[PDB]
Design a protein around this ligand. Structure first.
Ligand SMILES: [Zn+2]
Ligand SMILES: [Zn+2]
Lengths: 296, 72, 102, 186, 187
RNA sequence: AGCUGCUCCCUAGCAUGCUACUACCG
RNA sequence: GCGGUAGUAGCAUGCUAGGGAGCAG
């Protein structure tokens, strides 16, 4: 438990139905859950009615029933609504300031990241909210990429040429050089270690990692990672130095790096370097040039 | 002064135990012997000997960042 | 009857995680340990009654710290305490007098 | 619990009775004020009790959930709190023999086995560069853990025995510098 | 209760009573209306306060029924577990040596302590130090319990494999030193 | 990871009992 | 005016049950 993102006050609640379960305060979470369709919150215990084999998962209908949260037809004689006053019952109910403008986080959550306004809000929002938008992007692409088919090769036609077979219910995604496949070799116990490959139509042309034998029944799947939360923002609140700090200039002038001497001082007194460089303008020659600006 | 060294010995053996040292029988046996001998000592001149011996075990591994934890 | 003071102090100092090393979460451990150590206040040796008085002072400190946390983090106050009896010695004295109130 | 609606009723009739006890009036209008107050001290003495108990119920539930949260979060940080506490206690202990080996390990000279206590038994220590060798080694004596040892052998990283006389400032960049000194306690 | 027969009677009784009070007809009208709304609240008392013990008792019964069903499922689960264990441990002892030594008994009864001694196919030896190793499990084969066993695999207290050429008198101080020898019965 | 005995604290339920207020009746 | 029965609120004793903890053999 800890402080929330939008509000920066300590909280103990989540959106259960939302994507990446962020921290949200009492009124904070209330706005997020009443303005849109996320209606499942997680405290130290989840907000569900413990009635044997009951169903409900809403937040505004469940009530307090002593030690636990119960359903309306399940609730004891006298109760205390968990979601009232403009707040949801949770930790630190007093020190919560909340917010009014919640269209940002609501849109970022309910969005599918399919169109241009998606990214418009993804950048033009709060920097922490844009980190959250980044993680939501990664989670969405991971969830949508494993949702495609499995490449179940059955034939052996040639080298760099085979035949594909895919299962029912899942279409076959664009066999592009953009997204790399991933395969595993079958055995009686498990199936592992073929690597990441790239397929396209041929007969099926495959781009293999390293030369080996093509067996029968190996599947090639667009596997996903286990993406983790972020800590630091995109960049630092920026600065111009008064001195050449932690740095001192060189003593000589370099022939290949004489065209960039005016570029040495200009960033030695700040953090970032806003580059506008077209492909092939000495794009990387300064990466070795500014490197020997001071070899220490 | 004896109480402090005994408490430090207890904490030191806890740190060694949570660094997966009991997966080597000989090392764990020696560490247990030193820890049990410090707790039964009566003069505070052999307790420091055994404390040097027992801390060398942690200093010889590479699971702790000495420069970071010793920021003073 | 009275116990060995080092047994009580050792029970106070060495534990099995969470069960102590955070006093505010249990507190009743020290109430039981002070019940066990009350009769030391009637010993001729003056270093023996200090154990009971140390336990009472620590109980008061723990209660104050828990209330301070609670008010500094929600804004909440326990309405009526009925807890000052735990750092006054009548509660512990009544456990050794022949009139059963178990 | 005076912020409840029914309080306004209970005072109202009570105020009437005040006027009554100020007036000295007949018998029936006092029955009025003994028939519309006992309905007030009954319609209010029920609302102002269950809510008072509910306040403490909410308080105790909040304390229980806070206890659970803090206990859950305490046993997820043992591996860092324990090391911090260990080094705080070591710093407070203030011993010369312990400070020596702690500072040597901070610079880079660390042992390779348990430090022995008997005057017999072998010690092996690593040396990362020449500065530590210079302020630690002197001739054939080794000062370590506030004790004195005599050198028996020096080697380099490729397990090739190096004689002691050649170790110096100018020949330094010719040896694999992670030296391993073997010594025996005086 | 909100829609039980007493509610309509009580509500209409007090509605007419207070309409006549707004009329304010008599002095016995007040007494009569108050008696009606004393006996009609004496209907909304039994039917709305004691009607609620029925529901509570029904819920007691329902929770007890749920508990009994769960306790009945757990019994079947543990029964299946126990009989699976028995049958899986059965499939190892039905050899031909056991039949031999049971058909050599005069009643079919034998002491249990001799069943592993004369029928087990694999032996495990735990050795504390070098002299005991030199007295018991020396070489590649040894004799014990009127049988002859051949060695395969030796490990230490860390469960790591040791070769038979490392167990000497000079290399002894470098081993984790309970040693566990596994041997097979030679025909 | 055991068998007992004693003690402290919190919650819920029921019975009993006490006390107070409204209603019916005698 | 009193007694009884039917109601509502508060208090007291013990009895069962659930949970946490301490000591002794
Ligand atoms: Zn959400
Ligand atoms: Zn339900």
């Amino acid at each position: 438990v800890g402080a929330c993102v939008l509000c920066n006050s300590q909280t103990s609640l989540r959106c259960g139905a939302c994507i990446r379960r962020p921290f949200l305060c009492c009124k904070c979470c209330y706005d997020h859950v009443i303005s849109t369709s996320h209606k499942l919150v997680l405290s130290v215990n989840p907000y569900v009615c413990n009635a044997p084999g009951c169903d409900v998962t809403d937040v505004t209908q469940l009530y307090l029933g002593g030690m636990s949260y119960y359903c309306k037809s399940h609730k004891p004689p006298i109760s205390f609504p968990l979601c009232a006053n403009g707040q949801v019952f949770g930790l630190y109910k007093n020190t919560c300031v909340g917010s009014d403008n919640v269209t940002d986080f609501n849109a970022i959550a309910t969005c599918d990241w399919t169109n241009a306004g998606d990214y418009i809000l993804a950048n033009t929002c709060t920097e922490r909210l844009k980190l959250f938008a980044a993680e939501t992007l990664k989670a969405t692409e991971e969830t949508f990429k494993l949702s495609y088919g499995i490449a179940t090769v059955r034939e052996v036609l040639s080298d760099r040429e085979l035949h594909l077979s895919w299962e029912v219910g899942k279409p076959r995604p664009p066999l592009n050089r953009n997204y790399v496949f991933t395969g595993y070799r079958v055995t009686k116990n498990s199936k592992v270690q073929i690597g990441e490959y790239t397929f396209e139509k041929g007969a099926v042309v495959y781009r293999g990692t390293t030369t080996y034998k093509l067996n029968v029944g190996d599947y090639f799947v667009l596997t996903s990672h286990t993406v983790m939360p972020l800590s630091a923002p995109t960049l630092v609140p920026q600065e111009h130095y008064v001195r050449i700090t932690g740095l001192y200039p060189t003593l000589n002038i370099s022939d290949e790096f004489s065209s960039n001497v005016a570029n040495y001082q200009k960033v030695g007194m700040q953090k970032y370097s806003t580059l506008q460089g077209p492909p092939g303008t000495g794009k990387s020659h300064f990466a070795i040039g500014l490197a020997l600006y001071y070899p220490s | 002064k004896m109480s402090d060294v005994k408490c430090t010995s207890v904490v030191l053996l806890s740190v060694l135990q949570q660094l997966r040292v009991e997966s080597s029988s000989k090392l764990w046996a020696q560490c247990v012997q030193l820890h049990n001998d410090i707790l039964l000592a009566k003069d505070t001149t052999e307790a420091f000997e055994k404390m040097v011996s027992l801390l060398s075990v942690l200093l010889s591994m590479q699971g702790a960042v000495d420069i970071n934890k010793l920021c003073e | 009857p009275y116990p060995d003071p080092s047994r009580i102090l050792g029970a106070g100092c060495f534990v099995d995680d969470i069960v102590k090393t955070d006093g505010t979460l249990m507190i009743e451990r020290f109430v039981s340990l002070a019940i066990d150590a009350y009769p030391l206040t009637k010993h001729p040796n003056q270093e023996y009654a200090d154990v009971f008085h140390l336990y009472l002072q620590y109980i008061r400190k723990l209660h104050d710290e828990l209330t301070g946390h609670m008010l500094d983090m929600y804004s909440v106050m326990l309405t009526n305490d009925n807890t000052s009896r735990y750092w006054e010695p009548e509660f512990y004295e009544a456990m050794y007098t022949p009139h059963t109130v178990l | 619990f005076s912020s409840l609606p029914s309080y306004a009723a209970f005072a109202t009739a009570q105020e009437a009775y005040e006027q009554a006890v100020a007036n000295g009036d007949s018998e029936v209008v006092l029955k009025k004020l003994k028939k519309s107050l006992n309905v007030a001290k009954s319609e209010f003495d029920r609302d102002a009790a269950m809510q008072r108990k509910l306040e403490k119920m909410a308080d105790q539930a909040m304390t229980q959930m806070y206890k659970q949260a803090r206990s859950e979060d305490k046993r997820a940080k043992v591996t860092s709190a324990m090391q911090t506490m260990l080094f705080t206690m070591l710093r407070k202990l203030d011993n010369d023999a312990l400070n020596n080996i702690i500072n040597n390990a901070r610079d880079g000279c660390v042992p390779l086995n348990i430090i022995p206590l008997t005057t017999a038994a072998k010690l092996m220590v690593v040396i990362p560069d020449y500065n530590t060798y210079k302020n630690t080694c002197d001739g054939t004596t080794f000062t370590y853990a506030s004790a004195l040892w005599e050198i028996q052998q020096v080697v380099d990283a490729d397990s090739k025995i190096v004689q002691l006389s050649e170790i110096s400032m100018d020949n330094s960049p010719n040896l694999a510098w992670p030296l391993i000194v073997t010594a025996l306690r005086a």
